[PDB]
Amino acid sequence: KIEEGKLVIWINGDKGYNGLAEVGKKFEQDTGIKVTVEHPDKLEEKFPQVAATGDGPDIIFWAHDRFGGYAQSGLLAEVTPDKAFQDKLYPFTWDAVRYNGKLIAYPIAVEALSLIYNKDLVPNPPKTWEEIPALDKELKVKGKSAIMFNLQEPYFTWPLIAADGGYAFKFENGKYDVKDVGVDNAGAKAGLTFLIDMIKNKNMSADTDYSIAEAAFNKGETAMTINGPWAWSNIDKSKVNYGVTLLPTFKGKPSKPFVGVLSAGINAASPNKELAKEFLENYLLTDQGLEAVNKDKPLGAVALKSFQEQLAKDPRIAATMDNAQKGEIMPNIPQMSAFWYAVRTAVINAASGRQTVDAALKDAQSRITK
């Protein structure tokens, strides 16, 4: 059972959890209520397990794509911001957290992947994916590579798979059609084939993950990476002079990152729903609260208009929004789970050579539309 008279918060380990705990400390100073911030391994998989028995945190942070599944399962409370509070955030961010007519979380930040480049290694970043192999060939002479990014999580490869026509679920007749999936169309295959060709030509390695890519970029070993705003503060601390820019085009079309809205949901089993609302509305979603988290690990563009206005001038934030505008906001529908897990398997199998691109994506399409 969840303890009454305290708040327990779960947030992903790549986010500014120490900054969030500082907001928790302010809450405690004011109200005497203890806030415990945790970053469990695989929290987004553990949550539906424990919440189903009336357990888990009072508040869970994730991108909104997970939240439709949680709400469908009865695991999230309807949030009750008044009109004046809703007016403080951008309308589209509330749309991301609306499920079957109900608001089921508070939006916090708007995340998109960008191309991150070392200004000293590549003063003029490549406008196209197609030119990157030639760039790699020149950099290899100096024992450097053109690009490294996480090939284990489909989030990072999706912008290239989507570029030429890949999609998750078609929005038709005012809703996502769960039987109209675009993972094995010609566009999707063209994008994944390009990635695989990069691997075959030794521009990248199939085993590259978040840690490997991050270490290589931040140590000046690779010229470019693909990452989101949470990554910037580690690069700030590194010796690398980096820029954040538009993702490269593929076949003349923009890369299309899936846009996530970092959101805070209240456990339907929480005996602390009022405290959660007070914390989220009156502590976190303030200039001071967001600043605390943002100083720890950057949130990106934020949902809170007053604070976003202060961030807007930063070229990294401009680049984030430019990439977001080329991409699409993720569905929050339950079937996003089927989609992501199936795509994950497809990318890993194709990259490793266990399957061809065509066979991997066809199997993903069959799995998702079951």
Ligand X SMILES: C[C@H]1O[C@H](O[C@H]2[C@H](O)[C@@H](O)[C@@H](O[C@H]3[C@H](O)[C@@H](O)[C@@H](O)O[C@@H]3CO)O[C@@H]2CO)[C@H](O)[C@@H](O)[C@@H]1N[C@H]1C=C(CO)[C@@H](O)[C@H](O)[C@H]1O
Which two structure tokens, joined as six digits, stand for 45?
Answer: 């998989």
Which two structure tokens, joined as six digits, stand for 108?
Answer: 């916090």
Min dist CB 303 to ligand X, Å, is 14
User: CA dihedral in degrees (296, 302, 304, 310; nearest 10)?
Assistant: 80
Q: How many CA atoms lie within 13 A of 332 on its CB side?
A: 27
Report the residue number, 204 or 330, with the smaller CB distance to ligand X: 330
Report the residue number, 35 or 336, with the smaller CB distance to ligand X: 336
Min dist CB 35 to ligand X, Å, is 22
Report the residue number, 111 or 164, with the smaller CB distance to ligand X: 111
Min dist CB 361 to ligand X, Å, is 16
Min dist CB 153 to ligand X, Å, is 4
Report the residue number, 96 or 266, with the smaller CB distance to ligand X: 96
User: CA dihedral in degrees (11, 284, 324, 16; nearest 10)?
Assistant: -40
Report the residue number, 66 or 189, with the smaller CB distance to ligand X: 66
Min dist CB 82 to ligand X, Å, is 28
Q: Give the whole-angstrom CA distance, residue 64 versus residue 96.
A: 6
Report the residue number, 31 or 337, with the smaller CB distance to ligand X: 337
Q: Give the whole-angstrom CA distance, residue 262 versus residue 109.
A: 5
Report the residue number, 90 or 341, with the smaller CB distance to ligand X: 341
Min dist CB 15 to ligand X, Å, is 7
Residue 301's CB is within 10 A of a number of other CB atoms, namely 24
- Burial class of residue 177 (count of CB atoms within 10 Å of its CB; 0-12, 13-18, 19+): exposed
Min dist CB 264 to ligand X, Å, is 13
Site residues, ligand X (CB under 6 A)? 12, 14, 42, 44-45, 63, 65-66, 111, 153-155, 228, 260, 340-341, 344
Min dist CB 328 to ligand X, Å, is 13
Min dist CB 332 to ligand X, Å, is 10
Min dist CB 32 to ligand X, Å, is 32
